[PDB]
Write a protein that binds this ligand. Structure first.
Ligand SMILES: N[C@@H](CCC(=O)N[C@@H](CS)C(=O)NCC(=O)O)C(=O)O
Ligand SMILES: N[C@@H](CCC(=O)N[C@@H](CS)C(=O)NCC(=O)O)C(=O)O
Ligand SMILES: CCCCCCCCCCCC[N+](C)(C)[O-]
Ligand SMILES: CCCCCCCCCCCC[N+](C)(C)[O-]
Ligand SMILES: CCCCCCCCCCCC[N+](C)(C)[O-]
Ligand SMILES: CCCCCCCCCCCC[N+](C)(C)[O-]
Lengths: 598, 600
């Protein structure tokens, strides 16, 4: 299976079930019809040169223009109709097959999409929208062009080349056969080597192009700064040098295309000269008719027409196979966090959260939690704080099981979250993260995202609870207002309110505020804190905060130091104990004073 | 005037022609001539080679006077093969010879537009998204290149060959042959064009559906965490799938139409082939034509219609190219709001005073902001300009750098109207630390050296020191060679502002503007950077435009604007004593900070 050479053959054999689905009957029928079109088309293009030969034969055999006019007429007509029929068959196979192609590449993409959602967070999917888009565009284009060239150029040419070998064998040579075979081998080898060199030149050109373009764009988007320093000539010279470098590379890349074409024509035309001279010589001895000259010439040109593109074809097919392999690699990549076999659903009857001796790090060379243990009572409002090495920033990710502990475990109610389904576990948890993100869609879509079947009543209710309802009401399109980019831009508080609303639609027993106010300004922070407190009403709530004053009203505060639970208690108990929390508090307090001094 | 004409493809091409025939270079003109010569050799060759095939066939079938016919036929078969190879050689040689001319032409067009865009007004607000603009420019470049290649190396050669075939068919056949082929070419072009219009519309729909499916997929992938938090994997999968199906449907229709165009084309071509060949054989029957004539006619027709096999695509590309190029020329034609007057002298700053003399201005003609603003900034003084929300203070710097001109009134530096001097000297006299400094996608050292064209490593080190960012840079692993901006290391607000300060230090202008320089900063960063700003403002004329009065309280004098005019002027203490607009503002601002300080 996967236990193979990992060449194009493996990738292709892997792709084969997509083309011959065994899910879909209609598509299989389409495949068969396309293959029939290939065969009819080839039979037609192989037959038509014979008709041309006979027409010439009739006009040379040959005392006069006698009953032979009728014969010659019939045969040229057969030839022309043959040409049209060949093209008709080719275009009909493309037309029949196209749906199969489209479904196959769609299903491949969907499989990759699904596996990517199953894969680990640590792949760190944080990148540029335009760049990933450019990569995906280039790649889909790649796989499509490859697929088309393999099925509809290379394969028909293999059939045709074999047929020409047999026919040339039975009717000529067999010096003809070896001559053509050598011509084809020299042709492919030359095209291949020249193409490898060409692909390198292309890559250099593409890079230089990107550089000239980047300079131009950076300049235009910094028009103000350029004016401030009167730097127009400078930026112009800067674009110009880059542009020249690009143009030089482009001239080389294109010229190499000229060289490939010339090499190809040399090979074809040596073959043509040889075949035709030899055919004429065979004519002189009465072995071959004059029509044979026409016949061989047509067979050779027809054979070498698809090979006119072989370079591009080669490049394309190669790249496609690469890209497709990349796809399959993702599908194969193993999943770090998985449900255990026959994992039960998590049943939340009493929403306690337990960390039991948790040892964890994102990477095995940097341990962060060194045996963290704590208990959060059901329905309590708890805070988790600490200085720079505490490891509090792992809590949310562990609770949602983005990762597993190296040692120890997390429990919700009485149950190890590692032994339940990921879906039930996440169904029980709400989060308002530090940087809330909006989908490129309406505000209603964004709020309703909290639960799958969320009704507009639920959206209104959540928006009310998050106290963002009025702001939406004063929008012309209300809930149907598009947001994100390209959409309406929300303030930080408005975004955090959309996130809160989203979690309200979910209505989870356990709610986490994960540095929820850390990006907000002071007034925004203070405003949203009453909403958060209200929204924590009958939930078990865990708030991870940098700034202690924002969580001082907690039922209890867990203080972490060096990946372990250092101190525990109410804000007052902790101030009395005069330990780490008190120091932190004093420190922050002092700092708040200093800023106010200015 | 060539611009005084209909706005079509012909005009665009006529505009582009000087680029191809520079009259600056001569080397390139010689290259163009050489390329045209290769077109002619190539056409003579491809026209000549079928006669060689014809003769070879003629020799074999009429060996009466063409003897030894084996020798004659061999010679002709070899002439035919050599003719083919030679045709290809001539064609690739015209491409190879011309390519430099093409690249230079399009480079010069791009450079012309680039210069023009830097000349055009700020109000166009060119700052927009990088990826979108880049994708557009890539698409356009490919478009114009492809158009140029198809125009020069496909359409034009085919026009030459078509005329030649018409003449040759005329002289040796028909002339039913001539009319048949011409009608065929006409039917071919008309069919291809009309089918291509439909095809292009389908292509656009396909592309739009493609972009929507891709955007859904990308939004999901970059929001993997959110998708996880809400268990939305199935929803995202289904949401991608529906879009993907819409795209696949569009793609299927779009590809299928290509099959239709190919069939229509082959139908036309093959009617012409059947008729022409049948006619040639019938002419043979009457002793009018040789059998080699059949080979000759057939070969001529296939050679003719081979470039036309691409006519659909060609038509789509050339058209698109012509559109894109027109857009280029449109930008080049767009007029320049702010230009130097003819023969403008340099601004000569011997004593760097600044005057606003009765200035009336607005960004737009329906909304006037300054209503007769007048003030004098003494040479070497440090002054501030403050006011409430409609004061118009945010126009001052833009007017000084002459991003816009006054509707009425004028601005002077050292007694010289800045409207009447070269823009480059004027801007040479001015330094600015703006509210949001922007960095080039380049090294931090490049960004600092940007202050002056020939900036040495020493000048940069000195500026980094004066801006007090030198230590921060020293602690960078790559130092001055550290890449910054987007696509690079992220600097804090203070670090960026310090880079801006360092830039102006490298420039060393006589007049310095702080244009809300500290307004985006946090309080402590503001307090830190203010001492730096005071140091660099040492012996310069400094004008500080600030929202928060406490940051400018130490000014030599303060200009208070209200409603686009100068309401109040004087020292901070004098303004507090007058108990007017500045005092009110001062009190108000103090009050707010107190309340803010209260909320700890
Ligand atoms: N022979 C070259 C391909 C030649 C080629 O690309 N020809 C057509 C398209 S298939 C073209 O791009 N331009 C038409 C022409 O100038 O011949 C190769 O093997 O890659
Ligand atoms: N006849 C159509 C299509 C021509 C076409 O696409 N020709 C080459 C251009 S590179 C090609 O791709 N042929 C497809 C094939 O033979 O596989 C037109 O006039 O544009
Ligand atoms: C309908 C087409 C669906 C197929 C999906 C193909 C996307 C291609 C991405 C390949 C990227 C691989 N890489 C890194 C080598 O560029
Ligand atoms: C916004 C459209 C106008 C952009 C023109 C500016 C010229 C620089 C980029 C165009 C050509 C660069 N390229 C792609 C050939 O390297
Ligand atoms: C000379 C090379 C520079 C190429 C610049 C790209 C041109 C594209 C202009 C886009 C304008 C919109 N349009 C023409 C597609 O309708
Ligand atoms: C990170 C890139 C590799 C995986 C790509 C994700 C699969 C879905 C890609 C969407 C394909 C776009 N198209 C052509 C179907 O519209």
């Amino acid at each position: 299976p996967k236990d193979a050479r990992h060449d194009g053959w493996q990738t292709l054999k892997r792709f084969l079930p997509y083309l011959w689905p065994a899910d879909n009957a209609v598509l299989r029928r389409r495949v068969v019809g396309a293959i029939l079109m290939v065969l009819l088309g080839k039979a037609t293009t192989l037959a038509l040169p014979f008709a041309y030969k006979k027409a010439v034969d009739a006009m040379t055999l040959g005392g006069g223009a006698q009953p032979a006019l009728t014969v010659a007429l019939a045969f040229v007509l057969a030839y022309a109709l043959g040409r049209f029929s060949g093209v008709l068959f080719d275009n009909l196979r493309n037309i029949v097959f196209e749906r199969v192609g489209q479904d196959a590449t769609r299903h491949l993409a969907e499989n990759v999409f699904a596996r990517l959602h199953k894969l680990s967070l640590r792949f760190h999917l944080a990148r540029r929208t335009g760049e990933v888009t450019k990569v995906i565009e280039r790649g889909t284009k790649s796989i499509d062009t490859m697929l088309y060239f393999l099925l509809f150029n290379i394969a028909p040419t293999v059939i045709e080349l074999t047929a020409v070998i047999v026919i040339f064998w039975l009717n000529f040579g067999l010096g003809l056969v070896t001559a053509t075979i050598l011509a084809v081998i020299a042709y492919v080898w030359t095209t291949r080597t020249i193409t490898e060199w060409r692909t390198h030149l292309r890559e250099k050109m593409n890079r230089l192009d990107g550089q000239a373009l980047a300079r131009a764009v950076d300049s235009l988007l910094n028009y103000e700064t350029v004016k401030y320093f009167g730097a127009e000539s400078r930026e112009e010279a800067r674009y110009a040098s880059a542009a020249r470098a690009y143009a030089d590379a482009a001239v080389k890349s294109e010229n190499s295309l000229g060289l490939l074409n010339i090499a190809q024509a040399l090979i074809v035309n040596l073959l043509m000269a040889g075949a035709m001279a030899w055919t004429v010589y065979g004519w002189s001895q009465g072995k071959l008719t004059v029509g044979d000259l026409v016949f061989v010439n047509t067979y050779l040109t027809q054979l070498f027409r698809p090979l006119d593109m072989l370079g591009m074809v080669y490049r394309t097919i190669r790249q496609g196979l690469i890209d497709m392999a990349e796809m399959f690699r993702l599908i194969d990549t193993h999943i770090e966090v998985a449900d255990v076999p026959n994992a039960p659903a998590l049943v939340v009857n009493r929403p306690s959260v337990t960390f039991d001796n948790v040892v964890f790090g994102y990477d095995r060379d940097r341990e962060i939690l060194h045996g963290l243990s704590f208990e959060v009572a059901a329905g309590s409002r708890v805070a988790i704080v600490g200085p720079s090495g505490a490891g509090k920033s792992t809590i949310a990710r562990l609770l949602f099981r983005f990762y597993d502990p190296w040692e120890g475990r997390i429990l919700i109610d009485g149950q190890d979250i590692a032994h339940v389904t990921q879906t039930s576990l996440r169904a029980a948890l709400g989060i308002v993260p530090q940087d809330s993100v909006l989908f490129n869609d309406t505000i209603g879509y964004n709020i309703a995202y909290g639960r799958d079947g969320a009704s507009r009543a639920e959206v209104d209710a959540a928006a009310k609870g998050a106290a963002i309802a009025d702001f939406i009401a004063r929008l012309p399109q209300g809930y149907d207002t598009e947001v994100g980019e390209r959409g309406l831009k929300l303030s930080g508080g408005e975004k955090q309110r959309v996130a809160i609303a989203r979690t309200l639609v979910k209505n989870p027993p356990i709610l986490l505020f994960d540095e929820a106010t850390s990006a907000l300004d002071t007034r925004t922070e203070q405003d949203i804190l009453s909403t958060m407190r209200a929204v924590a009403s009958h939930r078990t709530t865990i708030s991870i905060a940098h700034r202690l004053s924002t969580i001082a009203d907690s039922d209890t505060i867990l203080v972490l130091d060096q990946g372990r639970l250092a101190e525990q208690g109410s804000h007052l108990d902790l101030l009395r104990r005069d330990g780490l929390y008190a120091e932190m508090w004093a420190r922050q307090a002092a700092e708040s004073a200093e800023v106010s001094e200015a």
